[PDB]
Amino acid sequence: GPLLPGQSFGGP
Amino acid sequence: GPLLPGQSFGGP
Amino acid sequence: GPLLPGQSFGGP
Amino acid sequence: GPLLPGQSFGGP
Amino acid sequence: GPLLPGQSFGGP
Amino acid sequence: GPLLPGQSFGGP
Amino acid sequence: HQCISPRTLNAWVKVVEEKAFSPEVIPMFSALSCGATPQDLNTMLNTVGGHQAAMQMLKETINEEAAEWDRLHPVHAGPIAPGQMREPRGSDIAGTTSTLQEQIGWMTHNPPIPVGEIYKRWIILGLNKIVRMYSPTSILDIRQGPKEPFRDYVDRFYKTLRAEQASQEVKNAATETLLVQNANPDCKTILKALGPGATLEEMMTACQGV
Amino acid sequence: HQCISPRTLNAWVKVVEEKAFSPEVIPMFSALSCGATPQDLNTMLNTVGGHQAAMQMLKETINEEAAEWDRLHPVHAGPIAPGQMREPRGSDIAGTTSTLQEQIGWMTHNPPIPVGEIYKRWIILGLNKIVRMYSPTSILDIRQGPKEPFRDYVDRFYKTLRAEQASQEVKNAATETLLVQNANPDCKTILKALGPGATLEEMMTACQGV
Amino acid sequence: HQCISPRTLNAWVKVVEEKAFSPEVIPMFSALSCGATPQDLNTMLNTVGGHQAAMQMLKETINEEAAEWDRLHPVHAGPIAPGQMREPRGSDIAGTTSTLQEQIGWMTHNPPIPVGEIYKRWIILGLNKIVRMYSPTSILDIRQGPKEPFRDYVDRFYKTLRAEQASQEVKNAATETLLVQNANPDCKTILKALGPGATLEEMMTACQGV
Amino acid sequence: HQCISPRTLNAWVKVVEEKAFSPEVIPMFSALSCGATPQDLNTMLNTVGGHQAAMQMLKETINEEAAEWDRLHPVHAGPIAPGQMREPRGSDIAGTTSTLQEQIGWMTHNPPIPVGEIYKRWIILGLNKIVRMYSPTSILDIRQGPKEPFRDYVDRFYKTLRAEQASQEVKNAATETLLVQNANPDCKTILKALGPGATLEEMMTACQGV
Amino acid sequence: HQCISPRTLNAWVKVVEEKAFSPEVIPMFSALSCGATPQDLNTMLNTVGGHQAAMQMLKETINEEAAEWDRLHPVHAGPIAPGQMREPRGSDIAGTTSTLQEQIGWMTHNPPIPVGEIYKRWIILGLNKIVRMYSPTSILDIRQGPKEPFRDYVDRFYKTLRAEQASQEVKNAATETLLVQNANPDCKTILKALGPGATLEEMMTACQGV
Amino acid sequence: HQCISPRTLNAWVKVVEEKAFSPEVIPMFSALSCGATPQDLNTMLNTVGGHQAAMQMLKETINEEAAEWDRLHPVHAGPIAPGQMREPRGSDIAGTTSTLQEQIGWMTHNPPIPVGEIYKRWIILGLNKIVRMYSPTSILDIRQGPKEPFRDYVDRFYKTLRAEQASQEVKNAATETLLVQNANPDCKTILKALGPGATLEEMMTACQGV
Ligand SMILES: [Cl-]
Ligand SMILES: [Cl-]
Ligand SMILES: [Cl-]
Ligand SMILES: [Cl-]
Ligand SMILES: [Cl-]
Ligand SMILES: [Cl-]
Ligand SMILES: [Cl-]
Ligand SMILES: [Cl-]
Ligand SMILES: [Cl-]
Ligand SMILES: [Cl-]
Ligand SMILES: [Cl-]
Ligand SMILES: [Cl-]
Ligand SMILES: [Cl-]
Ligand SMILES: [Cl-]
Ligand SMILES: [Cl-]
Ligand SMILES: [Cl-]
Ligand SMILES: [Cl-]
Ligand SMILES: [Cl-]
C-alpha cells in the first residue's frame, strides 16, 4: 500500500 | 467477431 | 474523368 | 513591372 | 539568504 | 546614441 | 511509434460533437488517423461519447470484415521463426488480440503488413454506412423553389447526392436525370435552351440573377 | 525521457472538468498518458482538483494491485550487478519508492520492465471501477417512449450498457434480451416481423421515420 | 511523407466557413496545401461540407485537365523496370487510380514527377473559376459616391477588379479607363489637374480629406 | 538548454490566476518546471503578479533551505581544475550567485549536480507550506448534512484532507476516525452495519441513493 | 525549404484585420516573414482580403524597385554553367518570373543570392509608405490638454511621430522643438524650470501627478 | 538562428496589452526573448503599439548604455583577419549598425560575444526604470484597514514594494520597519506579542481569522 490518503500520488 | 457490445474498442 | 459526382475526391 | 493590378502577387 | 524582498527571484 | 525617436528599433 | 497528440484527439472529439455523422467527418477521420496503429484507431473510437447506436453498428461492420479476412487469409499453425512475425488474424487487425508492439512489427516489416490501413478501411466502411443511413433526404425530394436561387438548389442537390445511399451508378446519372427536371419553370426554360452536354458551370451561369 | 507538454496537462485537466467520470475519459486518459513514466502518471492524477472521493478510491485500487504484484513478483536480497538494475517493487511501479531515473532504466532495459504500462493498467482498472459505479442507470431501466425515435432509444441503450457494471457476459446478451423487448409497441411489431438474427443496422432501418 | 496536421485541416475548414469563395481563399489553400500529395489534396477537398455546387464544378474542371494530360502525355504499355516507376495517368495525378506510395515515389523520383503540384494547379484553376463566377459585381458598377472617401472607393475598385472575370488585359487598363472617370465630380477635378501618368499614391494623396 | 516555451509560461500564469494556491497547483508547477534550470525556475516565480505575500514566504523558505545546504555542503577554497567545475553554494542553486552556463554545467556534469531539482524541491517545499496554510477548513469541520449525498460529503472530506496541515500520521487515520463518525444518522447506520475494514468503494456503494 | 505554418498565415491575416496599417504591423510582417522565399512573401500578401487600395500601391512600389534593380543589375545573355545558376531579374526577385526551386537555389548558393531579403525590403518599403500616408495626424496637432496627464500627451506625441511622414531629421528635432512648447501652461512652467538637455524621464517625472 | 515563432510575438504583444508595465512583464519579456539576436529584440520592441512614451524612454536608456560600452570597449582600426570578426560597437549591440549574420557570428564565436545578452540587459534596465516610475504608490502609503484581512494588506505591501523605486537597502528593511507598524491596532497587538525575529509565516498565521 504505497499511496496514502491526503498525500500526493507517488509519496513525499 | 472481436468487438463486443458495451466493451471498449480493442477488447479488455 | 476520374472524379465522380456524389463520390469522395479520389474515388472509392 | 512584374506585378499587375487585379492579379495575384507573383503573376499567373 | 540569497532571495531579497521586493527583488526579482535570482537577484539583480 | 543609435536609437532615434520616431524610428524603428534598430535603425533604417 | 509516436502517440496521438492531444490536439489530434481534441480535434476528433470536437468534430464528432459539431458535425455528428455528416459526410465530411469521414475524410477528417482518415486524415487525423493517418499512420495510426490499430490501438490508436480503437482509442479514437473509444473517445466518442454518445452516438453509441452508430458505434455499435460500427462494431458489427468491423466484425463482419474481420470474419471475411479470416476466411480469405486463413492462419497456419507452427512456431514463428526468430527473424519473422506471426500473421495477423481478424481480431489482430482490430487490435483485439494483438499488442501495440506486434502492430508496429507488422507495419514496419519487410514486406510490411499495414494492419492500420486494413483496420481503417473497415472503420471507414462502417462509417460510410452510418452517414448515408443517418441521411433523412433522398435526391428525388430536392426540388428548386419558385424563388430559390439556382446556386442554392444545386447546393442542396449535391449535398444530398453526396450523403445519398443508392449507388454510384445512380449518382453518376443523377445530374442528367433530376437536376434540370426539378428546377423551377423559369430557370428550366433557360437550361433546356442550352442543349444537352452543358457543364454545371454553363448551367449555373445561364440562370444567374434569376 | 521528455516531459508532459503543457497542452497534455491542460487537456487532461479540462476533460476531467467537462466529462467528469463518463466512460470516454478512460481512453483519453490512456491516450494522453502514452509512454508515460510512473512519475508522469502520478503527476496527471495529482493535477485533478475535486473528485477526491474517486481519487481516494483510485489509491485503494492501486494499493491492492501493488500488493498482488509483491505476492506474485517477490523481491530477492543481494547487490545489484553493475550492468543491470534492481527489480521494481509494488511501490516502485507506483512511483512511490522509485526515482525517475530508475523508471526510465526499467522502461529502456533489455529486456525492458514497462513499469509505466503496468502502473497505467492499475490506474485504468481503478478508473473503470469508478465509471461504472458513478453510473446511476441500469440497462433494465432503458425503455423506448411512445414517441421516442428508435435511434434515440438505441443511443441511450448502448450508452447505458457501456457504463454498466454487470459483466461482459450480460453485455453480450443484452441486445438479444432487452433491446426489442423494451421498445414501444409500434416499433416492436416491426422488429418481430424481421426474425431473429437481424443486425442492428437492419433493426434501426426497419423502424426509420416512426 | 508526413501527414496533414490537425491545425492544417482545422484552418482550411474554418477559412471555407468564414471567407467562402472570396479571392483570398485560393492563396491560403495553396499555402496550407504545400508539399501535399494528391491524397492529401483530395482529403482537403473532401473535408468541405456544403458548397457542393462549387465542389461539383471543381470535379468537372479537374476531369477536363486530366483529359488534357492524357492527350498530351499518352501512356505506353510495357513492364516497369525494377529501378523505375510507371508514368502517372490523369486519374493517377488526381489520386483516383494511384496509391499514396506511388504519389510519393513520383514526387521523390530523380527526376521527380511532381504529381502534387500538377494536381494543385488543376484544383487552383477550378477554384479560380468559382471565385470570379461567384462574384456579383462588375468593375463598371464601382462608382464613387458624392461623399464616399476616395480611399474607400479605390478599396472597392480593386477588390472588385481582383475577383473580376474579364481578362488580365482588361484589369491592366482598368485603372486608366474607369478609376478617374467613375470618381465623384469634386475628386475628379483634382485628379484631372494632375495629368496622366500619376501613380495611385499620387492620386489618393491629392484627394485626401475630401 | 532550450528555453521556456511561451505556452509553458502562459499556462503557469493562467493556473496561478485560476486555481490560486489550491493543492493541484504544485503538481502542475513541477510538471511545467521539468528539466528547468534555476534561472528558468526564478523566471516562473517572477511572472506571478499578485500573491506577493506568498511569494515573500516562498523567498524565506528558500533562504532557509539554502542556509541548510551551506551547513551540510560547506565550500572549499582553491582553484577549479580545467576539466571540472566549482561546487554550487546555496545562492548558486537558487540562481542568485550562479550563471545559466554554470547551472547547465552542473546539471550535465558526470556525475551531474542537479541544481534544478534541488532548487525545485525547495520551491515545492515552500509552496506546500502556503497551500496548507491558505486552507481555511479543518478535517474536523467536515460533517455530512442531513440530505447531503454521501459522495459529496466524501468529496469534501478528502479535498479538505489533501490541503490539511496536521501530519501524514493524522491523514492516514482520518478515514477510520472521522469519516463514518461525521456522517448523517441514516447513512451512519448502514456503514456501521458493514463492520470495520470496509473499503471506500464498499462504504460509498452501501449508501448509494440515500 | 519548409512551408508557412498555418499559425503563421493565421497570425498575419488576423493582424491585418485588427491593426490595419498602424506602424506595428510592419515589424510583425517582417518577423512572420523571416527566411521566406519570394513565393512565401507573395502568398502572405495574397491572403490579405480588403485593403486592396494599399495592396495596389504595394504593387507599384515593388514594380519601381524591380525596375531599379534591372538598371543596377543588368542581365547578361549566355548559357548557365552546370554548377551555377542564372542571375535573378527584377521579376525573379518578386517571384513573378522565378520558380520556388530557383529562389531556394539563389538563397542557398555560395555566395547566396538572398532574393527573399531583397523582395522583403521592397515590400517593407511599400508598406512604410502606406503606414505614414494612412496617418491622419501631424505632430504639430499634438497639444496637451488643460487636464491631460503629461504621460498621455507624450504617449500621443511619439505615437504620432512614429507614423509621421516628414523625415528622420524632423523626428530627431521634434522633441526639442514641439514637446515642451505644446504642453499645457502648468506643466510648461515646470519643464522650463529644468533647463535644456533634460531627458524624457526627467521631464515626465517633474510633471507627475499634475 | 531560428526565428521568433508567431506564438512568441503573439504572447509578447498580448502581455503588453494586458499587464502594461507591471513588474511581471520584465521576466516574461526576458523569457520570451531568450537566445534572441539584437534583431529579434528590436523586432519585439517594434511590435509594441502605444506606450510610445516608455518606448522613447527605452531608446534613451539604450543610447546611454551604448555610449558607456563605447567608452569601456573602444574600437581599434585595422583589417579583420579572415578567421575572426570585428568587435561590436554600441550601435552594433543594439542592432543598429550590425547585420543579423554578424550578430550570429558574435554569439557563436569562440569565445562568443553574447551581443544579444548585452542588449537584453540594456533593454531590461530601461524597462525596470519604466516599471518603478509608472508606479503611483509608495510603500509608506500601504496601511492595513480596520477590517482589512492581514493577508490582503501583506499582499498589497509586497506588491507595492516590488514595484517600488527607493533602493534594495530600503526594500530589505521595509518589513522590519513598516509592516507591523502600519497594521491595524487589533493585529498589531498580536504581532508585538510575538517578539522580533518572527518570520512572515509566523506573522500571518498569528493574525489568521481576524
Ligand atoms: Cl459526441
Ligand atoms: Cl509474432
Ligand atoms: Cl434539403
Ligand atoms: Cl475537476
Ligand atoms: Cl538499481
Ligand atoms: Cl437515460
Ligand atoms: Cl463550409
Ligand atoms: Cl509503378
Ligand atoms: Cl461594392
Ligand atoms: Cl496572479
Ligand atoms: Cl566553475
Ligand atoms: Cl467544505
Ligand atoms: Cl483585412
Ligand atoms: Cl538557372
Ligand atoms: Cl491623437
Ligand atoms: Cl499595447
Ligand atoms: Cl566582421
Ligand atoms: Cl494599494
Side-chain angles (χ1 to χ4, degrees):
Chain A
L3 297 179
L4 305 181
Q7 184 178 82
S8 69
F9 278 89
Chain B
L3 297 179
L4 305 181
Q7 184 178 82
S8 69
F9 278 89
Chain C
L3 297 179
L4 305 181
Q7 184 178 82
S8 69
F9 278 89
Chain D
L3 297 179
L4 305 181
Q7 184 178 82
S8 69
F9 278 89
Chain E
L3 297 179
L4 305 181
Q7 184 178 82
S8 69
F9 278 89
Chain F
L3 297 179
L4 305 181
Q7 184 178 82
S8 69
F9 278 89
Chain G
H1 149 269
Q2 194 50 222
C3 323
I4 301 203
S5 59
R7 61 174 182 163
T8 299
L9 306 145
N10 179 52
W12 169 240
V13 169
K14 274 172 191 173
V15 74
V16 175
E17 269 168 15
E18 301 153 354
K19 320 264 209 169
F21 284 110
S22 322
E24 71 261 32
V25 316
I26 268 63
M28 220 164 328
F29 168 75
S30 175
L32 291 162
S33 60
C34 175
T37 65
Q39 177 175 317
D40 302 307
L41 294 172
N42 288 322
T43 293
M44 290 190 62
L45 309 179
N46 282 327
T47 52
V48 172
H51 312 287
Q52 290 301 101
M55 303 309 287
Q56 184 49 47
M57 280 194 296
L58 188 54
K59 291 189 181 177
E60 295 186 5
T61 302
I62 289 166
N63 294 351
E64 287 186 20
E65 301 304 308
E68 169 86 337
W69 176 273
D70 291 348
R71 187 199 69 139
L72 279 204
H73 299 85
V75 86
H76 305 104
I80 307 309
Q84 307 304 42
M85 210 162 323
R86 74 188 179 89
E87 308 107 288
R89 293 263 68 193
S91 48
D92 286 317
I93 294 166
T96 293
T97 48
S98 72
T99 185
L100 176 59
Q101 310 89 251
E102 280 168 320
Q103 295 160 18
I104 307 185
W106 282 317
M107 292 154 63
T108 78
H109 207 242
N110 204 207
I113 318 274
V115 283
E117 282 324 291
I118 305 159
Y119 192 24
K120 181 193 287 215
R121 185 172 74 240
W122 303 348
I123 300 173
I124 288 182
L125 169 62
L127 291 185
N128 270 5
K129 298 207 287 229
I130 290 155
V131 162
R132 313 189 189 102
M133 156 184 188
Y134 276 12
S135 72
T137 312
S138 149
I139 194 58
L140 307 150
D141 303 330
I142 303 304
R143 294 138 177 152
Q144 189 192 9
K147 324 181 280 132
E148 180 168 31
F150 189 64
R151 186 209 300 168
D152 295 340
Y153 155 65
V154 177
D155 257 343
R156 301 190 293 114
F157 185 89
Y158 285 105
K159 174 183 174 175
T160 310
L161 190 72
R162 178 187 193 177
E164 262 264 29
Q165 298 99 312
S167 60
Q168 198 45 60
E169 287 106 305
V170 164
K171 294 198 204 176
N172 292 344
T175 297
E176 198 186 338
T177 309
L178 309 179
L179 191 63
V180 56
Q181 160 68 24
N182 288 340
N184 55 31
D186 270 351
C187 273
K188 201 173 192 165
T189 62
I190 309 184
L191 301 154
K192 308 254 212 198
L194 295 189
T199 64
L200 183 54
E201 174 185 7
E202 285 161 339
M203 293 173 106
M204 310 172 77
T205 38
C207 310
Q208 206 164 314
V210 191
Chain H
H1 149 269
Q2 194 50 222
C3 323
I4 301 203
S5 59
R7 61 174 182 163
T8 299
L9 306 145
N10 179 52
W12 169 240
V13 169
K14 274 172 191 173
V15 74
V16 175
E17 269 168 15
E18 301 153 354
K19 320 264 209 169
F21 284 110
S22 322
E24 71 261 32
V25 316
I26 268 63
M28 220 164 328
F29 168 75
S30 175
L32 291 162
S33 60
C34 175
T37 65
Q39 177 175 317
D40 302 307
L41 294 172
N42 288 322
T43 293
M44 290 190 62
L45 309 179
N46 282 327
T47 52
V48 172
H51 312 287
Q52 290 301 101
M55 303 309 287
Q56 184 49 47
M57 280 194 296
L58 188 54
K59 291 189 181 177
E60 295 186 5
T61 302
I62 289 166
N63 294 351
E64 287 186 20
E65 301 304 308
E68 169 86 337
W69 176 273
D70 291 348
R71 187 199 69 139
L72 279 204
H73 299 85
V75 86
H76 305 104
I80 307 309
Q84 307 304 42
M85 210 162 323
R86 74 188 179 89
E87 308 107 288
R89 293 263 68 193
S91 48
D92 286 317
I93 294 166
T96 293
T97 48
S98 72
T99 185
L100 176 59
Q101 310 89 251
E102 280 168 320
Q103 295 160 18
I104 307 185
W106 282 317
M107 292 154 63
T108 78
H109 207 242
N110 204 207
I113 318 274
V115 283
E117 282 324 291
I118 305 159
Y119 192 24
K120 181 193 287 215
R121 185 172 74 240
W122 303 348
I123 300 173
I124 288 182
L125 169 62
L127 291 185
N128 270 5
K129 298 207 287 229
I130 290 155
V131 162
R132 313 189 189 102
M133 156 184 188
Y134 276 12
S135 72
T137 312
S138 149
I139 194 58
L140 307 150
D141 303 330
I142 303 304
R143 294 138 177 152
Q144 189 192 9
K147 324 181 280 132
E148 180 168 31
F150 189 64
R151 186 209 300 168
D152 295 340
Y153 155 65
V154 177
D155 257 343
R156 301 190 293 114
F157 185 89
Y158 285 105
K159 174 183 174 175
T160 310
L161 190 72
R162 178 187 193 177
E164 262 264 29
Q165 298 99 312
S167 60
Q168 198 45 60
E169 287 106 305
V170 164
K171 294 198 204 176
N172 292 344
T175 297
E176 198 186 338
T177 309
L178 309 179
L179 191 63
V180 56
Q181 160 68 24
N182 288 340
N184 55 31
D186 270 351
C187 273
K188 201 173 192 165
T189 62
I190 309 184
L191 301 154
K192 308 254 212 198
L194 295 189
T199 64
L200 183 54
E201 174 185 7
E202 285 161 339
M203 293 173 106
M204 310 172 77
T205 38
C207 310
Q208 206 164 314
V210 191
Chain I
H1 149 269
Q2 194 50 222
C3 323
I4 301 203
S5 59
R7 61 174 182 163
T8 299
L9 306 145
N10 179 52
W12 169 240
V13 169
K14 274 172 191 173
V15 74
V16 175
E17 269 168 15
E18 301 153 354
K19 320 264 209 169
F21 284 110
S22 322
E24 71 261 32
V25 316
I26 268 63
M28 220 164 328
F29 168 75
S30 175
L32 291 162
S33 60
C34 175
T37 65
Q39 177 175 317
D40 302 307
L41 294 172
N42 288 322
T43 293
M44 290 190 62
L45 309 179
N46 282 327
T47 52
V48 172
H51 312 287
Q52 290 301 101
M55 303 309 287
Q56 184 49 47
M57 280 194 296
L58 188 54
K59 291 189 181 177
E60 295 186 5
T61 302
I62 289 166
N63 294 351
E64 287 186 20
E65 301 304 308
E68 169 86 337
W69 176 273
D70 291 348
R71 187 199 69 139
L72 279 204
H73 299 85
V75 86
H76 305 104
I80 307 309
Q84 307 304 42
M85 210 162 323
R86 74 188 179 89
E87 308 107 288
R89 293 263 68 193
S91 48
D92 286 317
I93 294 166
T96 293
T97 48
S98 72
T99 185
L100 176 59
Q101 310 89 251
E102 280 168 320
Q103 295 160 18
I104 307 185
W106 282 317
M107 292 154 63
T108 78
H109 207 242
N110 204 207
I113 318 274
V115 283
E117 282 324 291
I118 305 159
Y119 192 24
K120 181 193 287 215
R121 185 172 74 240
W122 303 348
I123 300 173
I124 288 182
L125 169 62
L127 291 185
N128 270 5
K129 298 207 287 229
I130 290 155
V131 162
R132 313 189 189 102
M133 156 184 188
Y134 276 12
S135 72
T137 312
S138 149
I139 194 58
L140 307 150
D141 303 330
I142 303 304
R143 294 138 177 152
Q144 189 192 9
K147 324 181 280 132
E148 180 168 31
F150 189 64
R151 186 209 300 168
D152 295 340
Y153 155 65
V154 177
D155 257 343
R156 301 190 293 114
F157 185 89
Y158 285 105
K159 174 183 174 175
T160 310
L161 190 72
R162 178 187 193 177
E164 262 264 29
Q165 298 99 312
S167 60
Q168 198 45 60
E169 287 106 305
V170 164
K171 294 198 204 176
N172 292 344
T175 297
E176 198 186 338
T177 309
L178 309 179
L179 191 63
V180 56
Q181 160 68 24
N182 288 340
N184 55 31
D186 270 351
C187 273
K188 201 173 192 165
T189 62
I190 309 184
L191 301 154
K192 308 254 212 198
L194 295 189
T199 64
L200 183 54
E201 174 185 7
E202 285 161 339
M203 293 173 106
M204 310 172 77
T205 38
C207 310
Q208 206 164 314
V210 191
Chain J
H1 149 269
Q2 194 50 222
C3 323
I4 301 203
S5 59
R7 61 174 182 163
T8 299
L9 306 145
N10 179 52
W12 169 240
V13 169
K14 274 172 191 173
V15 74
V16 175
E17 269 168 15
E18 301 153 354
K19 320 264 209 169
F21 284 110
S22 322
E24 71 261 32
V25 316
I26 268 63
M28 220 164 328
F29 168 75
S30 175
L32 291 162
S33 60
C34 175
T37 65
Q39 177 175 317
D40 302 307
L41 294 172
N42 288 322
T43 293
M44 290 190 62
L45 309 179
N46 282 327
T47 52
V48 172
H51 312 287
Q52 290 301 101
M55 303 309 287
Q56 184 49 47
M57 280 194 296
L58 188 54
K59 291 189 181 177
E60 295 186 5
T61 302
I62 289 166
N63 294 351
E64 287 186 20
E65 301 304 308
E68 169 86 337
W69 176 273
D70 291 348
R71 187 199 69 139
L72 279 204
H73 299 85
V75 86
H76 305 104
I80 307 309
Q84 307 304 42
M85 210 162 323
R86 74 188 179 89
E87 308 107 288
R89 293 263 68 193
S91 48
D92 286 317
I93 294 166
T96 293
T97 48
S98 72
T99 185
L100 176 59
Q101 310 89 251
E102 280 168 320
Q103 295 160 18
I104 307 185
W106 282 317
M107 292 154 63
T108 78
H109 207 242
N110 204 207
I113 318 274
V115 283
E117 282 324 291
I118 305 159
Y119 192 24
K120 181 193 287 215
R121 185 172 74 240
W122 303 348
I123 300 173
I124 288 182
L125 169 62
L127 291 185
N128 270 5
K129 298 207 287 229
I130 290 155
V131 162
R132 313 189 189 102
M133 156 184 188
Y134 276 12
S135 72
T137 312
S138 149
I139 194 58
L140 307 150
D141 303 330
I142 303 304
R143 294 138 177 152
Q144 189 192 9
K147 324 181 280 132
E148 180 168 31
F150 189 64
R151 186 209 300 168
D152 295 340
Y153 155 65
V154 177
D155 257 343
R156 301 190 293 114
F157 185 89
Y158 285 105
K159 174 183 174 175
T160 310
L161 190 72
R162 178 187 193 177
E164 262 264 29
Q165 298 99 312
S167 60
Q168 198 45 60
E169 287 106 305
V170 164
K171 294 198 204 176
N172 292 344
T175 297
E176 198 186 338
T177 309
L178 309 179
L179 191 63
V180 56
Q181 160 68 24
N182 288 340
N184 55 31
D186 270 351
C187 273
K188 201 173 192 165
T189 62
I190 309 184
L191 301 154
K192 308 254 212 198
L194 295 189
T199 64
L200 183 54
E201 174 185 7
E202 285 161 339
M203 293 173 106
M204 310 172 77
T205 38
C207 310
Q208 206 164 314
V210 191
Chain K
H1 149 269
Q2 194 50 222
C3 323
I4 301 203
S5 59
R7 61 174 182 163
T8 299
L9 306 145
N10 179 52
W12 169 240
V13 169
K14 274 172 191 173
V15 74
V16 175
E17 269 168 15
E18 301 153 354
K19 320 264 209 169
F21 284 110
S22 322
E24 71 261 32
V25 316
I26 268 63
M28 220 164 328
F29 168 75
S30 175
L32 291 162
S33 60
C34 175
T37 65
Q39 177 175 317
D40 302 307
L41 294 172
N42 288 322
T43 293
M44 290 190 62
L45 309 179
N46 282 327
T47 52
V48 172
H51 312 287
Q52 290 301 101
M55 303 309 287
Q56 184 49 47
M57 280 194 296
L58 188 54
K59 291 189 181 177
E60 295 186 5
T61 302
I62 289 166
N63 294 351
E64 287 186 20
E65 301 304 308
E68 169 86 337
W69 176 273
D70 291 348
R71 187 199 69 139
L72 279 204
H73 299 85
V75 86
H76 305 104
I80 307 309
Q84 307 304 42
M85 210 162 323
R86 74 188 179 89
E87 308 107 288
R89 293 263 68 193
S91 48
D92 286 317
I93 294 166
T96 293
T97 48
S98 72
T99 185
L100 176 59
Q101 310 89 251
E102 280 168 320
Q103 295 160 18
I104 307 185
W106 282 317
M107 292 154 63
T108 78
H109 207 242
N110 204 207
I113 318 274
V115 283
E117 282 324 291
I118 305 159
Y119 192 24
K120 181 193 287 215
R121 185 172 74 240
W122 303 348
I123 300 173
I124 288 182
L125 169 62
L127 291 185
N128 270 5
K129 298 207 287 229
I130 290 155
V131 162
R132 313 189 189 102
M133 156 184 188
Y134 276 12
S135 72
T137 312
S138 149
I139 194 58
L140 307 150
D141 303 330
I142 303 304
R143 294 138 177 152
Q144 189 192 9
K147 324 181 280 132
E148 180 168 31
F150 189 64
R151 186 209 300 168
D152 295 340
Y153 155 65
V154 177
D155 257 343
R156 301 190 293 114
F157 185 89
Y158 285 105
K159 174 183 174 175
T160 310
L161 190 72
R162 178 187 193 177
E164 262 264 29
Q165 298 99 312
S167 60
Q168 198 45 60
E169 287 106 305
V170 164
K171 294 198 204 176
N172 292 344
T175 297
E176 198 186 338
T177 309
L178 309 179
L179 191 63
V180 56
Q181 160 68 24
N182 288 340
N184 55 31
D186 270 351
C187 273
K188 201 173 192 165
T189 62
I190 309 184
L191 301 154
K192 308 254 212 198
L194 295 189
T199 64
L200 183 54
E201 174 185 7
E202 285 161 339
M203 293 173 106
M204 310 172 77
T205 38
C207 310
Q208 206 164 314
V210 191
Chain L
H1 149 269
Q2 194 50 222
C3 323
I4 301 203
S5 59
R7 61 174 182 163
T8 299
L9 306 145
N10 179 52
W12 169 240
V13 169
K14 274 172 191 173
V15 74
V16 175
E17 269 168 15
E18 301 153 354
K19 320 264 209 169
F21 284 110
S22 322
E24 71 261 32
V25 316
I26 268 63
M28 220 164 328
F29 168 75
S30 175
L32 291 162
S33 60
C34 175
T37 65
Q39 177 175 317
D40 302 307
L41 294 172
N42 288 322
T43 293
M44 290 190 62
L45 309 179
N46 282 327
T47 52
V48 172
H51 312 287
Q52 290 301 101
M55 303 309 287
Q56 184 49 47
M57 280 194 296
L58 188 54
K59 291 189 181 177
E60 295 186 5
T61 302
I62 289 166
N63 294 351
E64 287 186 20
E65 301 304 308
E68 169 86 337
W69 176 273
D70 291 348
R71 187 199 69 139
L72 279 204
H73 299 85
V75 86
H76 305 104
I80 307 309
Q84 307 304 42
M85 210 162 323
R86 74 188 179 89
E87 308 107 288
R89 293 263 68 193
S91 48
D92 286 317
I93 294 166
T96 293
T97 48
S98 72
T99 185
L100 176 59
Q101 310 89 251
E102 280 168 320
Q103 295 160 18
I104 307 185
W106 282 317
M107 292 154 63
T108 78
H109 207 242
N110 204 207
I113 318 274
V115 283
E117 282 324 291
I118 305 159
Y119 192 24
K120 181 193 287 215
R121 185 172 74 240
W122 303 348
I123 300 173
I124 288 182
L125 169 62
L127 291 185
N128 270 5
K129 298 207 287 229
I130 290 155
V131 162
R132 313 189 189 102
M133 156 184 188
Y134 276 12
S135 72
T137 312
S138 149
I139 194 58
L140 307 150
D141 303 330
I142 303 304
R143 294 138 177 152
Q144 189 192 9
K147 324 181 280 132
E148 180 168 31
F150 189 64
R151 186 209 300 168
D152 295 340
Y153 155 65
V154 177
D155 257 343
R156 301 190 293 114
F157 185 89
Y158 285 105
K159 174 183 174 175
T160 310
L161 190 72
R162 178 187 193 177
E164 262 264 29
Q165 298 99 312
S167 60
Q168 198 45 60
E169 287 106 305
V170 164
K171 294 198 204 176
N172 292 344
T175 297
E176 198 186 338
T177 309
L178 309 179
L179 191 63
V180 56
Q181 160 68 24
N182 288 340
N184 55 31
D186 270 351
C187 273
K188 201 173 192 165
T189 62
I190 309 184
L191 301 154
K192 308 254 212 198
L194 295 189
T199 64
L200 183 54
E201 174 185 7
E202 285 161 339
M203 293 173 106
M204 310 172 77
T205 38
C207 310
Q208 206 164 314
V210 191

